[PDB]
Each structure stands twice: as structure tokens, then as C-alpha cells.
Amino acid sequence: LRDNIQGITKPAIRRLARRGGVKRISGLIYEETRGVLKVFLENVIRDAVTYTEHAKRKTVTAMDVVYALKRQGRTLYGFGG
Amino acid sequence: KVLRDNIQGITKPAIRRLARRGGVKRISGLIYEETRGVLKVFLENVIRDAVTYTEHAKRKTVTAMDVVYALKRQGRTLYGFGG
Amino acid sequence: RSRKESYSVYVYKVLKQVHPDTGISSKAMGIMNSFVNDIFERIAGEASRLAHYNKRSTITSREIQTAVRLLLPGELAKHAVSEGTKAVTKYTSA
Amino acid sequence: SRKESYSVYVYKVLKQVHPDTGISSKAMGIMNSFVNDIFERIAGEASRLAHYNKRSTITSREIQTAVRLLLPGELAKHAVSEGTKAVTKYTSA
Amino acid sequence: RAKAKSRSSRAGLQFPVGRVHRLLRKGNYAERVGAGAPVYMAAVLEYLTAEILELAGNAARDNKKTRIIPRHLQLAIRNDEELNKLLGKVTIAQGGVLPNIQAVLLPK
Amino acid sequence: RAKAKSRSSRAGLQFPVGRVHRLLRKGNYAERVGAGAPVYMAAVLEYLTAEILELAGNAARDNKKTRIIPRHLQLAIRNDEELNKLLGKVTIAQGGVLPNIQAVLLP
Amino acid sequence: PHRYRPGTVALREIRRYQKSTELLIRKLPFQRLVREIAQDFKTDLRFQSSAVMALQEASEAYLVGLFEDTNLAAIHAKRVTIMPKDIQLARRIRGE
Amino acid sequence: PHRYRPGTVALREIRRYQKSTELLIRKLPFQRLVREIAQDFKTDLRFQSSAVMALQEASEAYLVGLFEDTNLAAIHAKRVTIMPKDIQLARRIRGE
Numbered sequence: 001l002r003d004n005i006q007g008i009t010k011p012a013i014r015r016l017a018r019r020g021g022v023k024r025i026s027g028l029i030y031e032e033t034r035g036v037l038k039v040f041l042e043n044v045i046r047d048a049v050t051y052t053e054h055a056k057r058k059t060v061t062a063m064d065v066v067y068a069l070k071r072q073g074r075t076l077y078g079f080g081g
Numbered sequence: 082k083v084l085r086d087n088i089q090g091i092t093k094p095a096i097r098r099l100a101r102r103g104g105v106k107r108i109s110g111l112i113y114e115e116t117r118g119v120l121k122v123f124l125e126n127v128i129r130d131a132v133t134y135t136e137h138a139k140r141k142t143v144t145a146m147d148v149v150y151a152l153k154r155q156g157r158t159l160y161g162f163g164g
Numbered sequence: 165r166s167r168k169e170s171y172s173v174y175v176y177k178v179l180k181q182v183h184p185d186t187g188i189s190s191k192a193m194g195i196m197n198s199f200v201n202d203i204f205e206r207i208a209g210e211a212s213r214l215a216h217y218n219k220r221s222t223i224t225s226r227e228i229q230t231a232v233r234l235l236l237p238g239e240l241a242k243h244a245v246s247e248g249t250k251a252v253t254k255y256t257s258a
Numbered sequence: 259s260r261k262e263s264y265s266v267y268v269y270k271v272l273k274q275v276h277p278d279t280g281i282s283s284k285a286m287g288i289m290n291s292f293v294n295d296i297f298e299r300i301a302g303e304a305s306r307l308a309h310y311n312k313r314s315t316i317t318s319r320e321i322q323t324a325v326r327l328l329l330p331g332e333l334a335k336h337a338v339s340e341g342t343k344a345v346t347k348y349t350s351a
Numbered sequence: 352r353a354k355a356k357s358r359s360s361r362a363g364l365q366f367p368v369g370r371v372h373r374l375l376r377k378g379n380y381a382e383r384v385g386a387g388a389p390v391y392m393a394a395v396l397e398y399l400t401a402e403i404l405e406l407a408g409n410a411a412r413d414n415k416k417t418r419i420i421p422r423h424l425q426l427a428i429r430n431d432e433e434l435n436k437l438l439g440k441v442t443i444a445q446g447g448v449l450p451n452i453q454a455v456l457l458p459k
Numbered sequence: 460r461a462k463a464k465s466r467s468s469r470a471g472l473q474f475p476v477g478r479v480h481r482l483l484r485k486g487n488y489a490e491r492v493g494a495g496a497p498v499y500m501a502a503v504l505e506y507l508t509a510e511i512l513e514l515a516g517n518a519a520r521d522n523k524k525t526r527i528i529p530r531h532l533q534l535a536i537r538n539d540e541e542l543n544k545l546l547g548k549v550t551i552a553q554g555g556v557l558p559n560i561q562a563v564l565l566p
Numbered sequence: 567p568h569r570y571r572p573g574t575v576a577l578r579e580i581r582r583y584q585k586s587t588e589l590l591i592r593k594l595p596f597q598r599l600v601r602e603i604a605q606d607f608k609t610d611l612r613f614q615s616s617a618v619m620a621l622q623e624a625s626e627a628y629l630v631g632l633f634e635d636t637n638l639a640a641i642h643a644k645r646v647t648i649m650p651k652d653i654q655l656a657r658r659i660r661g662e
Numbered sequence: 663p664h665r666y667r668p669g670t671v672a673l674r675e676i677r678r679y680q681k682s683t684e685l686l687i688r689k690l691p692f693q694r695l696v697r698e699i700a701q702d703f704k705t706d707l708r709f710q711s712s713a714v715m716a717l718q719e720a721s722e723a724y725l726v727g728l729f730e731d732t733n734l735a736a737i738h739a740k741r742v743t744i745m746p747k748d749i750q751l752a753r754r755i756r757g758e
Contacts, residue, residue, distance in 0.1 A: 003698075008688075012691075017732075018679045020725070021676055028745065036728065036749065037724075045696060051323075052707075053704075059710060060713045062715075065720075066716065075442070076720055077194075077444060080198065081198030081199075084602040087599040087602045090595025092592065092595070100636075102590065103631070104584075105580070105636065130234060134217075142614060150217070152624050161287045162616060162620040174397070181401065188418050192418075192423070195424055199438070204374065208378070211388075220381075221383050222383040223380070228395070238433050248394045252390045267474045267475065271508045271512055272527070279516045279519060280526040282529070285529055289511070300500060314490040315489065315492070315493050316483060317493035317496055333507065333541045336506055341500065348498045381487060421683070445683035456673065547757065550627045552623050558584045642735065643738055658731075659735070
């Protein structure tokens, strides 16, 4: 359960880039991408934890994730709402 | 009376001065027009909301708060003119 | 059992008027439910502010109307206004 | 024909930090806009937390959580510390 | 007692009216809700619902289907400039993206 | 009959408490507001107020003054990442901007 | 004869405008532009002087922030001169 | 020894990934990433499977939008290949 950022495989990164319309990827992208993804996750997860904690729970629910995302200018549709 | 072409009221030096404050050193001749076409959209969006708020309140004169709400709606807050 | 509310039944009906021969997946329905709750909150939220700003305790068809104009862009905003204005005019006439 | 603001309280606070510093009317007007902006947000979030958890009452806890969601890093933290105390003390006061 | 009648039918709406009347008094948005408030709103929610479903339905037909899936909703919303914006920050589960490929990336 | 006493004094605060309580219960934030909420909040608003004023006072001194003006508030905020972030979208009248010039523009 | 070279003054002006706090856009011109725009939606449209100023500062702040990003785009493109396309990229990334 | 030239396949993958809706990041890996981050706030924390998916979809959506802007920046820079800096510029313009 360490450096699981490496669990984000290179192809996984490239495929996202492709979906974004990226045709060629610099060899230094993989690491740079991770440094951004991680921050995104940190901000969203933490808010979800904050909401979870407020509610006195241990299990993070989809709703806690939705509130965390929501407030960042990102409503997510599909998990309730 | 109706007004017109006050987009030119935003003079060239005025655009340059704004650009310079923003750290822009050198400005292409086409920027002036391009910039105005963007400023205009911004103004249109803010003024319109301010008017919309003004009309809702059934007033004719736009106040600072109507502008403040309009800007807040677009997400750019402004301090010192109310709040 | 506890019970949950949604607009699933109303969404089906609307679908029938636009596309009488089509259905909808459970996910698309879940999305439409997320959608309705989002729009509702925004309009109600803005309407709340208008009532507050203009010193009222009541939301009327106008606060709803203005909230619509502020939240919806261009013409889409208009049809919503036309339909609302009418629905009230009509409701009291129906 | 009467308004209310925080101008008097802001003035005092300036002295707690800078006893010899004065303030313009505009800086005060800006601080007033600031206070009202933060107030609305925290109250907004506290409302919501009560709403999400299907409740009618806002307590010091909702305020605390709201502070964290809105404020970043230490500001959120020092505010929680101070809020906690004021309540702890007010009760014992 | 006089016969009770559903209000949605009455307003020429499919969306519930009494309920919206109610929901407008919750979250503490306003102490009171006017009689025409939920009627006006119900019409709006229904209208927008129809616009999305119609466009999504067209997408379903483009794909030779008999129903709407999350993808069709995404395509519909994005292709329609005004809905694209209304929901411009919305992430749709399994929405995918529009097939937009920059010309500079293509050969001759 | 106990003498009326400002809560701000009781809480050791400068910001009003009774008023905050008053504002919280209305504006339709909730049906009810607990006794400790206004107090917690008053402390928070006061804390943040102090942080801005403290830094602005320092900016005032950078400019060799004994006073705070809109500019000093701008400088105070933008040289503090956390306040800058909290207010990253705030336009301050006559606040101005920071004197940042890119190296690539220089000789 | 004596004069400064191109770019010497530009850097100077960058310093100076960053430094000062006043308006860079003329007031009556701006005010009129506001009205010219306003007259599209409706007539009988009046403004308080404080409303116009509020609009002006927000408007300048907007453009200045836009220029900062524009300048970066020009730098990204290895240039000093900003062109309409550097503005357009910045806006597009913002999501305008 | 038939081959498809550089860029033929890359465009193909772009087409496909734009079209499809499925998750591109492996699940067990992603799930663990979430937890590693989570444990830095709190040990013995749990997630619903729907919460993890909700995070993953938002996470991918974020990165894809980022890549779209990154791609535009690279194009602005007259380049097909995206470099770490193009990501950085896009983020900055966005206020990050």
C-alpha cells in the first residue's frame, strides 16, 4: 500500500491522454501527470473524509464523494444527487 | 439619445496600459481589436445581470449592489462597493 | 421499509412525448434524477436570494422567473420563462 | 433610515494586531465586504451540513466543519481552535 | 368532500406541483412559497427534461437504438450549445467525450 | 434582574455575538441555531479579520505608513498563500497587483 | 540625440502600471460604453456613478488577468509580442 | 513485414478512446491509490465500491480535460508532443 501512484500504469495515462486528443507524449509526462492526479485526488478525498467525519461515519459513501466534487465546480451525475 | 461606437472609447493607450500592467511587453497591432471583442463580452454579461437584478426589483436605476450581484453571479467578486 | 423519492416516473412520461417509442436505461434515469435535483436547487437557491435581497419572506413566480433568467443562457432561458409564466396563468384558470 | 456594519469591530481588531495603525474608510468598506462574504459562506455550509444529515439545528460542529471546507491549511485550523474555545468558554463563562 | 384531482394534470404538466410547492420551502430557502411558484418551476423542470430527452433520443436513433443511455445524454448535452453550458461543469458517468480531433494532427 | 451583558465580553471577543446568532437563525440558514454556533463563528470571523489586518499593517509599514488603505489589503493578501487562496477570486478596488516581471522580458 | 530603445520603456511601463492603483480606462468613455451596451436590453436605463465605477474596476481587472495569461502564452510560444491567438488560447483553457 | 506508420495508430487510439465510455485506469490499482492517499488523513477508513468508482470517473474526467488543454498548448507551441510544461501552463491559466 505504498507509492500506489505507480499502479497507474503508463498505458493508462497514455489512454487518457489519447481521449483528450493527445497524439504524442513526452517521456517526462508520466511523472508530471502523477503529480497532478495526486493533488486532484487529495483534494477530493479529503473533503469526502471531512464530510464522512462530520457525519460520524467510517465508510465513505458515494454521496460524500459527490459533495467533495460538487463544490469544486464539478457536479457528478449518476451516483444519486 | 441613442449612443454608438463607444467601444472606441476604450482607447489604444488604455488597452496597452492594461496589457502592460499584466506584464505584456510588446503588443501586436491586431490585439486592440481582439481585446475589445473580449472586453465587450465581459461587459455584456455583467451589465445584463445587473440589469436583470435591477428589473426584478422593478427599478430603473442600476445600483452598486446590482453590479456586485452580477459580478458575483459570474464568480468574480468585488470588494469595497458594497457587501 | 424506508422510502425514496425520484422523478423517474415523470421522466418516463416526458420521454414519451418527445419519443413515444423509446425507453431509458436505469443509469440514464439515475442521471436524470441527479439532473433534476441539481437544477431545482439552483433555481430555488437563486430564488431564495432574490427574496432575501428584495426583503421578502415569500418566493413567487417572479423569483422563480428571475432565477431562471440568471441561471439559464440565451434562448433556453426564454422557453423556460414562457412555459412557467403560462403554467401559472393557466393553473389558476384550470 | 439606518444601516449596520462591522466597521467598529474591525477598527478594534486592527489595534490588537497594530496598536498604532489607522485605517481608511474604504479599507473599512472592503473589510466589511469581506466579513459579510465569509459569514454567508460558513452559514451556508452549516445549513447544508444540517440539511445533508437531515437536521434542523446548526451547532458549533456544523460551523467547525464548514470552516474546514471553506478555509485552506492553517487558516482553517486556527479558526477551529479559536471557535472551539470561544464556545467552551462561553459556556463556562 | 369534493372530488380530489391531481394538480399536474390540471396545470397541463406531468411534473408534480404540490411537491415542488413543498420542496421550495425546504433547505430553508424561503419562509414561504407562493401559489404560482411551484407551478412556474414545475413547468421549467419539465421543459428542460424534455429538451435533454429529445436530443438524447435523437442520439439513440442515430445509434439505431430504442432507448437512451448515459452516453446519449452526454452527446445531446454537448452538441446543444445552451445545454452544453447549463451543464458545462457536469461530469456524466460513462458519458465519454465528443470525437473532436485537431486538424493539425491529421496527415494530408 | 441580572444586568444585561454583551456576549462579546463574555466570550472574550471583539466581534458581536448576539448579532451573529441573529444573522445565523435567519437568512434562512436553518430553522434553529444552537447556542454555541454564533460564538464559534464570531471567533472565526474575528480571527480572519485579524490576519488580514495584521498583514496589511505590515504592508502599511513597507510603505512607511501608519494607516491601512485598499492597496495594503491587496499586498497583505497576495503575499500570503492561504489568504490569497481564500480570496483568490476577489477583486479589491484600488488594490492593484504585485510587481511581477518575467525574466524573459529583461535584457 | 538621445532616446531609450524599444522595450526599455515597455518594461518601465510594466513596472509602473503594476505599481499604480488608478484606472487606465477613461471614465466618461467607459461610462458611455456601459450605456451603449445597456441600451440594447432596455431603455429608461440609468446608472449610479458608483455602479459605473464598480463595473470599470471589474472590467479592468478582468482584462489584466487575461493579459497575464496571454503574456504567458506568448512566452510559451517563445515570443515577446502578444497576438490575438495567445489571447484565444488563454481563454479557451479557461473555458470561455 | 507490413507496418502502419507513426501517427496512424495514435490517431486510431484517439478515435476510440473518445468514443468509448469505459474506465481506462485499472481498478484495483486506482482503488489502492485512493486508500494510500486516504490513510494520510486517517487509518482504518473504508469506502463503498460506488465511492471508488465515483472518484475514478471524476479523476479520469479531470485528467482528460487537462490533456485537452495540454494538447492545445502544445499545438500553440507548434508541437504534437505534449511536455510537462504544457500541462503546467494549462493548469496555471486555470488558476492552479
